[PDB]
DNA sequence: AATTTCACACCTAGGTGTGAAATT
DNA sequence: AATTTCACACCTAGGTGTGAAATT
Protein backbone atom coordinates (compact mmCIF):
# COMPACT_ATOMS: atom_id res chain seq x y z
CA UNK A 1 0.00 0.00 0.00
CA UNK A 2 1.33 3.89 0.66
CA UNK A 3 1.94 4.85 -2.36
CA UNK A 4 3.14 8.75 -3.42
CA UNK A 5 4.10 9.34 -7.01
CA UNK A 6 5.02 12.37 -8.75
CA UNK A 7 3.07 14.42 -11.62
CA UNK A 8 3.80 15.91 -14.71
CA UNK A 9 7.42 13.77 -13.83
CA UNK A 10 8.46 14.24 -17.80
CA UNK A 11 8.68 18.47 -17.20
CA UNK A 12 10.08 17.97 -13.73
CA UNK A 13 13.21 16.20 -15.43
CA UNK A 14 13.42 18.75 -18.09
CA UNK A 15 14.18 21.16 -15.48
CA UNK A 16 16.60 19.32 -13.32
CA UNK A 17 18.56 18.52 -16.41
CA UNK A 18 19.77 22.40 -16.56
CA UNK A 19 19.87 22.56 -12.72
CA UNK A 20 16.37 23.98 -11.53
CA UNK A 21 16.11 27.63 -9.87
CA UNK A 22 13.00 28.54 -8.11
CA UNK A 23 12.29 32.84 -8.24
CA UNK A 24 11.89 33.89 -3.81
CA UNK A 25 10.60 37.11 -3.86
CA UNK A 26 10.22 39.36 -0.74
CA UNK A 27 6.38 39.07 -1.27
CA UNK A 28 6.42 35.92 -1.82
CA UNK A 29 6.54 33.56 -4.97
CA UNK A 30 4.94 30.42 -6.44
CA UNK A 31 6.48 27.61 -7.47
CA UNK A 32 6.87 26.46 -11.00
CA UNK A 33 6.81 23.73 -12.01
CA UNK A 34 3.67 23.24 -9.51
CA UNK A 35 4.43 20.27 -7.13
CA UNK A 36 1.60 18.06 -7.75
CA UNK A 37 1.69 14.08 -6.72
CA UNK A 38 -0.37 11.45 -6.47
CA UNK A 39 -1.52 9.31 -3.19
CA UNK A 40 -2.62 5.73 -2.64
CA UNK A 41 -2.25 3.22 0.35
CA UNK A 42 -4.33 5.62 2.92
CA UNK A 43 -7.04 4.14 4.78
CA UNK A 44 -10.42 5.66 2.64
CA UNK A 45 -12.15 6.82 6.37
CA UNK A 46 -8.96 7.62 8.13
CA UNK A 47 -8.31 11.56 8.94
CA UNK A 48 -5.25 12.88 7.29
CA UNK A 49 -2.97 16.47 7.09
CA UNK A 50 -0.55 16.89 4.42
CA UNK A 51 2.49 19.07 4.96
CA UNK A 52 5.29 20.38 3.08
CA UNK A 53 8.80 21.84 3.92
CA UNK A 54 12.26 21.98 2.09
CA UNK A 55 15.24 20.08 2.93
CA UNK A 56 18.44 21.77 2.08
CA UNK A 57 20.27 19.46 -1.01
CA UNK A 58 23.79 19.90 0.35
CA UNK A 59 24.86 22.88 2.57
CA UNK A 60 27.17 25.02 -0.09
CA UNK A 61 25.74 28.66 -1.68
CA UNK A 62 25.93 28.49 -5.33
CA UNK A 63 27.00 31.55 -7.36
CA UNK A 64 26.93 31.17 -11.41
CA UNK A 65 30.48 31.18 -12.91
CA UNK A 66 30.93 31.32 -16.96
CA UNK A 67 27.42 30.11 -17.62
CA UNK A 68 27.15 27.20 -15.03
CA UNK A 69 26.24 27.06 -11.59
CA UNK A 70 29.13 25.77 -9.41
CA UNK A 71 29.71 25.68 -4.98
CA UNK A 72 31.92 28.17 -3.33
CA UNK A 73 32.96 29.16 -0.15
CA UNK A 74 32.54 27.70 3.54
CA UNK A 75 29.56 24.96 4.07
CA UNK A 76 27.25 25.70 6.33
CA UNK A 77 24.66 23.07 7.69
CA UNK A 78 20.82 24.50 6.14
CA UNK A 79 18.22 23.69 8.99
CA UNK A 80 14.90 22.40 7.28
CA UNK A 81 11.94 25.15 6.30
CA UNK A 82 9.37 25.40 8.45
CA UNK A 83 6.29 23.84 7.35
CA UNK A 84 3.66 24.29 5.13
CA UNK A 85 -0.04 22.59 5.80
CA UNK A 86 -1.50 21.91 2.63
CA UNK A 87 -4.90 23.93 2.46
CA UNK A 88 -7.29 20.79 2.03
CA UNK A 89 -6.11 19.48 5.39
CA UNK A 90 -7.48 17.67 7.78
CA UNK A 91 -9.10 15.66 5.35
CA UNK A 92 -10.02 11.98 4.71
CA UNK A 93 -7.55 9.24 2.79
CA UNK A 94 -10.53 8.83 0.50
CA UNK A 95 -10.40 12.84 -0.59
CA UNK A 96 -6.61 12.32 -0.59
CA UNK A 97 -6.71 9.93 -2.79
CA UNK A 98 -9.45 10.88 -5.11
CA UNK A 99 -7.60 13.94 -7.29
CA UNK A 100 -3.90 14.35 -7.29
CA UNK A 101 -2.34 16.84 -4.73
CA UNK A 102 -1.61 20.14 -5.51
CA UNK A 103 1.04 22.53 -4.17
CA UNK A 104 -0.50 25.48 -5.84
CA UNK A 105 -0.43 27.94 -3.52
CA UNK A 106 2.58 27.65 -1.82
CA UNK A 107 4.39 30.52 -1.50
CA UNK A 108 8.44 31.15 -1.61
CA UNK A 109 10.23 33.77 -0.01
CA UNK A 110 13.49 34.95 1.54
CA UNK A 111 11.86 36.82 4.28
CA UNK A 112 11.03 36.06 7.72
CA UNK A 113 7.18 36.95 6.95
CA UNK A 114 4.74 34.83 9.28
CA UNK A 115 2.45 34.87 6.56
CA UNK A 116 2.54 31.36 6.22
CA UNK A 117 5.12 31.43 3.22
CA UNK A 118 8.43 29.77 3.03
CA UNK A 119 10.86 31.31 3.69
CA UNK A 120 13.95 29.90 1.99
CA UNK A 121 17.96 31.29 1.62
CA UNK A 122 18.66 32.41 -2.17
CA UNK A 123 21.91 30.66 -3.95
CA UNK A 124 21.38 27.52 -1.93
CA UNK A 125 19.92 24.20 -3.47
CA UNK A 126 16.24 22.73 -1.72
CA UNK A 127 14.24 19.40 -2.07
CA UNK A 128 10.53 19.57 -1.45
CA UNK A 129 9.49 16.74 1.28
CA UNK A 130 5.74 16.00 1.39
CA UNK A 131 4.16 14.68 4.74
CA UNK A 132 0.92 12.73 5.68
CA UNK A 133 0.49 12.99 9.31
CA UNK A 134 -2.54 11.00 10.74
CA UNK A 135 -5.52 12.79 12.26
CA UNK A 136 -7.01 11.67 15.64
CA UNK A 137 -6.43 8.15 17.87
CA UNK A 138 -3.47 7.94 20.07
CA UNK A 139 -1.06 6.09 17.58
CA UNK A 140 1.16 8.27 15.58
CA UNK A 141 1.61 7.85 12.04
CA UNK A 142 3.95 9.66 9.94
CA UNK A 143 5.24 8.99 6.28
CA UNK A 144 7.69 11.20 4.21
CA UNK A 145 8.57 10.88 0.57
CA UNK A 146 11.01 13.44 -1.70
CA UNK A 147 11.56 13.72 -5.04
CA UNK A 148 15.34 14.35 -6.68
CA UNK A 149 13.36 15.58 -9.43
CA UNK A 150 12.26 18.30 -7.77
CA UNK A 151 15.42 19.74 -6.85
CA UNK A 152 15.82 23.37 -7.87
CA UNK A 153 18.82 26.60 -6.56
CA UNK A 154 16.66 29.41 -4.68
CA UNK A 155 16.98 32.53 -6.68
CA UNK A 156 16.11 36.36 -6.82
CA UNK A 157 16.71 36.22 -10.65
CA UNK A 158 17.14 33.69 -13.09
CA UNK A 159 20.55 33.09 -14.36
CA UNK A 160 20.36 30.28 -16.97
CA UNK A 161 18.12 31.40 -20.09
CA UNK A 162 17.81 28.12 -20.96
CA UNK A 163 15.39 27.77 -17.81
CA UNK A 164 13.64 31.19 -18.46
CA UNK A 165 12.71 29.84 -21.91
CA UNK A 166 11.40 26.89 -19.90
CA UNK A 167 9.32 28.72 -17.77
CA UNK A 168 8.25 31.11 -20.34
CA UNK A 169 6.94 28.28 -21.90
CA UNK A 170 5.19 26.08 -19.60
CA UNK A 171 3.77 28.65 -17.03
CA UNK A 172 0.63 30.33 -18.04
CA UNK A 173 1.07 33.64 -16.66
CA UNK A 174 4.04 34.17 -18.68
CA UNK A 175 2.19 33.93 -21.81
CA UNK A 176 2.68 37.39 -22.87
CA UNK A 177 6.38 36.50 -23.13
CA UNK A 178 5.91 33.06 -24.83
CA UNK A 179 3.50 34.83 -27.80
CA UNK A 180 6.22 37.67 -28.06
CA UNK A 181 8.68 35.09 -29.00
CA UNK A 182 5.87 32.79 -31.36
CA UNK A 183 5.93 35.93 -33.90
CA UNK A 184 9.15 37.74 -33.72
CA UNK B 1 -22.53 28.77 24.24
CA UNK B 2 -23.26 28.12 20.24
CA UNK B 3 -24.01 31.22 18.33
CA UNK B 4 -24.27 31.63 14.94
CA UNK B 5 -24.33 34.87 13.09
CA UNK B 6 -24.89 37.20 10.19
CA UNK B 7 -21.83 39.37 9.00
CA UNK B 8 -23.22 42.50 6.40
CA UNK B 9 -26.73 42.83 7.96
CA UNK B 10 -26.96 45.64 6.99
CA UNK B 11 -26.46 45.41 3.64
CA UNK B 12 -28.36 42.28 3.62
CA UNK B 13 -31.52 44.27 5.72
CA UNK B 14 -31.64 46.86 2.72
CA UNK B 15 -32.18 44.28 0.41
CA UNK B 16 -34.82 42.45 2.11
CA UNK B 17 -37.06 45.99 2.47
CA UNK B 18 -36.52 45.92 -1.87
CA UNK B 19 -37.38 42.21 -1.82
CA UNK B 20 -34.41 40.64 -2.75
CA UNK B 21 -33.58 39.11 -6.29
CA UNK B 22 -30.93 36.59 -6.99
CA UNK B 23 -29.48 35.80 -10.38
CA UNK B 24 -29.71 32.34 -11.24
CA UNK B 25 -27.81 30.83 -14.97
CA UNK B 26 -27.63 28.00 -17.22
CA UNK B 27 -23.91 28.03 -16.13
CA UNK B 28 -24.01 28.85 -12.12
CA UNK B 29 -23.93 32.39 -10.51
CA UNK B 30 -22.80 33.16 -7.20
CA UNK B 31 -24.76 35.10 -4.88
CA UNK B 32 -24.62 38.76 -4.18
CA UNK B 33 -24.51 39.77 -1.11
CA UNK B 34 -21.75 37.00 -0.33
CA UNK B 35 -23.16 35.23 2.55
CA UNK B 36 -20.87 35.41 5.54
CA UNK B 37 -21.37 33.94 9.02
CA UNK B 38 -19.49 34.12 12.20
CA UNK B 39 -19.86 30.78 14.59
CA UNK B 40 -18.84 30.43 18.30
CA UNK B 41 -19.23 28.05 20.93
CA UNK B 42 -18.19 24.77 18.94
CA UNK B 43 -15.29 22.57 20.71
CA UNK B 44 -12.52 23.93 19.40
CA UNK B 45 -11.26 20.78 18.98
CA UNK B 46 -14.17 18.62 17.67
CA UNK B 47 -13.91 17.79 13.77
CA UNK B 48 -17.02 19.96 12.24
CA UNK B 49 -18.94 20.10 8.58
CA UNK B 50 -20.91 23.01 7.41
CA UNK B 51 -23.35 22.93 4.87
CA UNK B 52 -25.90 25.23 2.57
CA UNK B 53 -28.99 24.15 1.63
CA UNK B 54 -31.78 26.30 0.62
CA UNK B 55 -35.56 25.95 1.77
CA UNK B 56 -38.13 27.18 -0.18
CA UNK B 57 -39.94 30.52 1.87
CA UNK B 58 -43.75 29.61 0.35
CA UNK B 59 -45.26 27.57 -1.98
CA UNK B 60 -46.13 30.19 -4.52
CA UNK B 61 -44.36 31.03 -8.01
CA UNK B 62 -43.74 34.88 -8.06
CA UNK B 63 -44.75 37.19 -11.02
CA UNK B 64 -43.46 41.15 -11.25
CA UNK B 65 -46.91 43.09 -11.85
CA UNK B 66 -47.05 46.62 -11.90
CA UNK B 67 -43.36 47.18 -9.78
CA UNK B 68 -44.18 44.72 -7.39
CA UNK B 69 -43.98 40.87 -6.59
CA UNK B 70 -46.37 39.21 -6.14
CA UNK B 71 -47.95 35.70 -5.87
CA UNK B 72 -49.87 33.38 -7.88
CA UNK B 73 -51.58 30.38 -9.62
CA UNK B 74 -51.70 27.24 -8.12
CA UNK B 75 -49.42 26.40 -5.29
CA UNK B 76 -47.00 23.15 -5.19
CA UNK B 77 -44.31 21.48 -3.42
CA UNK B 78 -41.03 23.00 -4.11
CA UNK B 79 -38.49 20.12 -2.27
CA UNK B 80 -35.04 21.45 -0.28
CA UNK B 81 -32.50 22.38 -2.73
CA UNK B 82 -29.29 19.79 -3.02
CA UNK B 83 -26.60 20.08 0.03
CA UNK B 84 -23.53 22.29 -0.30
CA UNK B 85 -20.76 21.10 1.62
CA UNK B 86 -18.57 24.65 2.65
CA UNK B 87 -14.75 23.58 0.63
CA UNK B 88 -13.24 23.82 4.53
CA UNK B 89 -14.61 20.65 5.53
CA UNK B 90 -13.79 18.99 7.53
CA UNK B 91 -12.25 21.15 10.14
CA UNK B 92 -11.68 21.89 13.58
CA UNK B 93 -14.05 24.12 15.74
CA UNK B 94 -10.98 26.29 16.41
CA UNK B 95 -10.69 26.98 12.60
CA UNK B 96 -14.57 27.57 12.33
CA UNK B 97 -14.67 30.00 14.86
CA UNK B 98 -11.28 31.50 13.94
CA UNK B 99 -12.59 33.64 10.75
CA UNK B 100 -15.94 34.82 9.26
CA UNK B 101 -17.28 31.54 7.30
CA UNK B 102 -17.95 32.31 3.94
CA UNK B 103 -20.06 30.44 1.69
CA UNK B 104 -18.68 32.90 -1.76
CA UNK B 105 -18.01 29.81 -4.08
CA UNK B 106 -21.93 28.33 -4.11
CA UNK B 107 -23.38 28.64 -7.62
CA UNK B 108 -26.81 28.87 -8.09
CA UNK B 109 -28.33 27.15 -11.38
CA UNK B 110 -31.62 26.88 -13.16
CA UNK B 111 -30.40 23.54 -14.79
CA UNK B 112 -29.91 19.83 -13.46
CA UNK B 113 -26.38 20.03 -14.12
CA UNK B 114 -24.11 18.26 -11.33
CA UNK B 115 -20.90 20.53 -10.50
CA UNK B 116 -21.42 21.21 -7.50
CA UNK B 117 -24.05 24.07 -8.28
CA UNK B 118 -27.21 24.23 -6.42
CA UNK B 119 -30.36 24.13 -8.35
CA UNK B 120 -33.36 26.40 -7.76
CA UNK B 121 -36.49 27.08 -9.64
CA UNK B 122 -36.64 30.83 -10.75
CA UNK B 123 -39.57 33.07 -9.70
CA UNK B 124 -39.44 31.22 -6.46
CA UNK B 125 -38.62 32.28 -2.96
CA UNK B 126 -35.89 30.79 -1.04
CA UNK B 127 -33.94 30.88 2.57
CA UNK B 128 -30.30 29.73 3.06
CA UNK B 129 -29.87 27.88 5.60
CA UNK B 130 -26.87 26.76 7.43
CA UNK B 131 -25.69 23.56 9.35
CA UNK B 132 -22.82 22.48 11.38
CA UNK B 133 -22.36 18.90 11.50
CA UNK B 134 -20.18 17.34 14.21
CA UNK B 135 -18.63 14.75 12.35
CA UNK B 136 -18.38 11.58 15.25
CA UNK B 137 -21.30 13.37 16.99
CA UNK B 138 -24.74 12.76 18.20
CA UNK B 139 -27.57 14.17 15.91
CA UNK B 140 -28.87 16.58 18.09
CA UNK B 141 -25.03 18.00 17.37
CA UNK B 142 -26.40 18.71 14.27
CA UNK B 143 -27.47 22.73 14.56
CA UNK B 144 -29.31 24.62 11.59
CA UNK B 145 -29.25 28.06 11.21
CA UNK B 146 -31.74 30.65 8.94
CA UNK B 147 -31.26 34.27 8.84
CA UNK B 148 -34.64 36.14 7.16
CA UNK B 149 -33.17 38.92 6.36
CA UNK B 150 -31.40 36.99 3.57
CA UNK B 151 -34.10 35.62 1.54
CA UNK B 152 -34.93 36.47 -2.19
CA UNK B 153 -36.74 35.25 -5.37
CA UNK B 154 -34.69 33.17 -7.68
CA UNK B 155 -34.76 35.10 -11.02
CA UNK B 156 -32.86 34.76 -14.50
CA UNK B 157 -32.62 38.56 -15.38
CA UNK B 158 -34.19 41.44 -12.36
CA UNK B 159 -37.11 43.07 -12.45
CA UNK B 160 -37.04 45.61 -9.64
CA UNK B 161 -33.88 48.39 -11.08
CA UNK B 162 -33.69 48.86 -7.27
CA UNK B 163 -32.11 45.98 -6.34
CA UNK B 164 -29.87 46.22 -9.97
CA UNK B 165 -28.84 50.01 -8.40
CA UNK B 166 -27.65 48.26 -5.13
CA UNK B 167 -25.88 45.16 -6.32
CA UNK B 168 -24.10 47.45 -8.81
CA UNK B 169 -23.13 49.62 -6.46
CA UNK B 170 -21.96 47.10 -3.87
CA UNK B 171 -20.50 44.39 -6.11
CA UNK B 172 -16.98 45.15 -7.01
CA UNK B 173 -17.74 42.59 -10.27
CA UNK B 174 -19.92 45.14 -11.24
CA UNK B 175 -17.49 48.33 -10.96
CA UNK B 176 -18.06 49.04 -14.84
CA UNK B 177 -21.86 50.03 -14.22
CA UNK B 178 -21.32 52.30 -11.30
CA UNK B 179 -18.53 53.61 -12.60
CA UNK B 180 -20.61 54.58 -15.15
CA UNK B 181 -22.98 56.93 -13.00
CA UNK B 182 -20.59 58.98 -11.02
CA UNK B 183 -19.05 61.09 -14.10
C1' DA C 1 31.28 43.37 -8.31
C1' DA C 2 27.10 40.57 -6.85
C1' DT C 3 22.53 40.22 -5.62
C1' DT C 4 18.05 42.17 -4.51
C1' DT C 5 14.32 45.28 -5.33
C1' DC C 6 10.68 47.42 -7.93
C1' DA C 7 7.47 49.73 -11.11
C1' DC C 8 5.55 48.10 -15.15
C1' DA C 9 3.47 45.96 -19.36
C1' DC C 10 0.97 41.87 -20.22
C1' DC C 11 -1.22 37.74 -19.23
C1' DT C 12 -4.49 34.22 -16.96
C1' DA C 13 -8.91 33.56 -14.69
C1' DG C 14 -13.17 34.42 -14.09
C1' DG C 15 -17.54 37.56 -12.01
C1' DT C 16 -21.03 41.46 -13.94
C1' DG C 17 -25.12 43.69 -15.90
C1' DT C 18 -26.48 44.87 -20.96
C1' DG C 19 -29.90 44.41 -24.28
C1' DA C 20 -31.13 42.08 -28.41
C1' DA C 21 -32.62 37.69 -29.78
C1' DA C 22 -34.42 33.18 -28.96
C1' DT C 23 -37.49 30.38 -26.75
C1' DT C 24 -41.82 28.78 -24.10
C1' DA D 1 -47.06 37.69 -23.70
C1' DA D 2 -43.35 36.15 -20.20
C1' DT D 3 -39.05 34.39 -19.46
C1' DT D 4 -34.52 32.69 -20.66
C1' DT D 5 -30.28 32.83 -23.27
C1' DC D 6 -26.04 34.77 -25.05
C1' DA D 7 -22.06 37.30 -26.85
C1' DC D 8 -19.81 41.21 -25.23
C1' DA D 9 -17.19 45.01 -22.99
C1' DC D 10 -15.49 45.89 -18.76
C1' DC D 11 -14.27 44.75 -14.07
C1' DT D 12 -11.74 42.49 -10.00
C1' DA D 13 -7.77 39.68 -8.59
C1' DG D 14 -3.46 38.48 -9.00
C1' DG D 15 0.71 35.61 -11.41
C1' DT D 16 5.15 36.64 -14.77
C1' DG D 17 9.64 38.02 -16.49
C1' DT D 18 11.78 42.49 -17.78
C1' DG D 19 15.56 45.76 -16.97
C1' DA D 20 16.68 49.92 -14.61
C1' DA D 21 17.97 51.21 -9.88
C1' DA D 22 19.10 50.46 -5.28
C1' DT D 23 21.41 47.79 -1.90
C1' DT D 24 25.23 44.89 -0.04
Redesign the pocket.
Known amino acids: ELKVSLEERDLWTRFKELTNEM?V??NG??M?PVLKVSMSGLDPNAMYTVLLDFVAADNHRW??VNGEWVPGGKPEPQAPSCVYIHPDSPNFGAHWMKDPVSFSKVKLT??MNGGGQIMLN??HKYEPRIHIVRVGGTQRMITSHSFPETQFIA????QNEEI?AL??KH???????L?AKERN
Open positions: ITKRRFKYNKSLVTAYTKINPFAKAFD
